[PDB]
């Protein structure tokens, strides 16, 4: 019984509970957290340097995601 | 030009992110705040779930 974590908006949680039922799954623990969301802009050439320092600064938590 | 990315951090890290952003010629285009529910789930590797999770969310939900 592998464990994972899942981050979701509150209005989606009961839907997650329901899907879990169709895999005999269970909710281990729950928490509530506020985060600041940033939309940033930098040159293509600096993305790696930024992403690297961003990992060092955040002990590997912070993840820079692309906008498609 | 300049490429755009999104980023999620707790409040106490933002200013560091801003400082680093300055060191690489970066700019903040937008900021916002959002509360989320963090779930710790326990399923068998039916891990089907991810596919249904994708349909349910339109690609935006990520199992970690």
């Amino acid at each position: 019984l592998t464990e994972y974590t899942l981050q979701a908006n509150w209005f989606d949680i009961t839907g997650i509970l329901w899907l879990l039922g169709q895999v005999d799954g269970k909710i281990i623990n729950s928490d509530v957290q506020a985060f600041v969301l940033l939309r940033v802009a930098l040159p293509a050439a600096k993305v790696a340097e930024f992403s690297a320092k961003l990992a060092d600064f955040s002990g590997g938590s912070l993840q820079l995601l692309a906008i498609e | 030009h300049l490429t755009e990315y999104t980023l999620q951090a707790n409040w106490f890290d933002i200013t560091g992110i801003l400082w680093l952003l300055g060191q690489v010629d970066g700019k903040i285009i937008n900021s916002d705040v959002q509360a989320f529910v963090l779930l710790r789930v326990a399923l068998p590797a039916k891990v089907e779930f991810s596919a249904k999770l994708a349909d349910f969310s339109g690609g935006s939900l990520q199992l970690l």
Partner: antibody, heavy 126, light 110 residues
Framework: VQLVQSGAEVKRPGSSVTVSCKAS????????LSWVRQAPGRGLEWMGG????????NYAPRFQGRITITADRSTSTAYLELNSLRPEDTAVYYC????????????????????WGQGTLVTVSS | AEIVLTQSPGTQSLSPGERATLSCRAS???????LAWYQQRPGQAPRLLIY???SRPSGVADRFSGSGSGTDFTLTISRLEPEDFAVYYC?????????FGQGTKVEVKL
């Protein structure tokens, strides 16, 4: 799925009111119940909610600190506690529960509110 | 943020049988098309017509249809019955802070 709310109430500035909402029909713990209100002649306004099974609450910032939403799995009953009543709180408070896909009570949760209480008027008067 | 939903028109008058086209526009993109439409008749509680921007729930007449995505949404009443004369609300629940539009009133023309 019926939801029945406590009767009208008349309160004084600074006081408190608790409105009850009792569900009958299908399961109760696995659906998001919310409280929505409407001042006289004005629009609907989402205040907050609870998912009973997980005891997870979610309040709109405007009311964060003044509002407590609780659930009682034994009686299938949600409660709205609103504190420091001001006269701008005068309104009809409706409880509202998300529906489920398909007919039958056991479908997929949809988030949007398909089931509503008759509403409860709270008057705050000096 | 507190996504503002602007409904238009504010009030409009139509005849029984005519087609109603209601607009709800979001200040920010709406998460996973989670936009709902409600009908509120005088003195009643609101009633759910559409969810997921375009999906119809159990028991809602076929004359009600929803469309749009992102920031621009539309409710369409193909042919107004007497009971369709009411106030209509949009709501977004695509983030944890949900919000409603200010409502569009559809009244009888004459």
């Amino acid at each position: 799925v019926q939801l029945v709310q406590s009767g009208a109430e008349v309160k004084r500035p600074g006081s408190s009111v608790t409105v009850s909402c009792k569900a009958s029909g299908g399961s109760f713990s696995t659906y998001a119940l919310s409280w929505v209100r409407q001042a006289p002649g004005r629009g609907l306004e989402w205040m907050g909610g609870v998912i009973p099974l997980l005891t997870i609450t979610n309040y709109a910032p405007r009311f964060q600190g003044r509002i407590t939403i609780t659930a009682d799995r034994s009686t299938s009953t949600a409660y709205l506690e609103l504190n420091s009543l001001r006269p701008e709180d005068t309104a009809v408070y409706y409880c509202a529960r998300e529906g489920t896909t398909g007919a039958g009570w056991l479908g997929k949760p949809i988030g949007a509110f398909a089931h509503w209480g008759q509403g409860t008027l709270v008057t705050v008067s000096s | 943020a507190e996504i503002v939903l602007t409904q238009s028109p504010g009030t409009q008058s139509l005849s029984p049988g005519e087609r109603a086209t209601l607009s709800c526009r979001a200040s920010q993109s709406v998460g996973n098309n989670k936009l709902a439409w409600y009908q509120q008749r005088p003195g009643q509680a609101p009633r759910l017509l559409i969810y997921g921007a375009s999906s119809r729930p159990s028991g809602v007449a076929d004359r009600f249809s929803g469309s749009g995505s992102g920031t621009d949404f539309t409710l369409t009443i193909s042919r107004l019955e007497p009971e369709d004369f009411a106030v209509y609300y949009c709501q977004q629940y695509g983030q944890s802070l949900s919000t409603f539009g200010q409502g569009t009133k559809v009244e009888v023309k004459l």
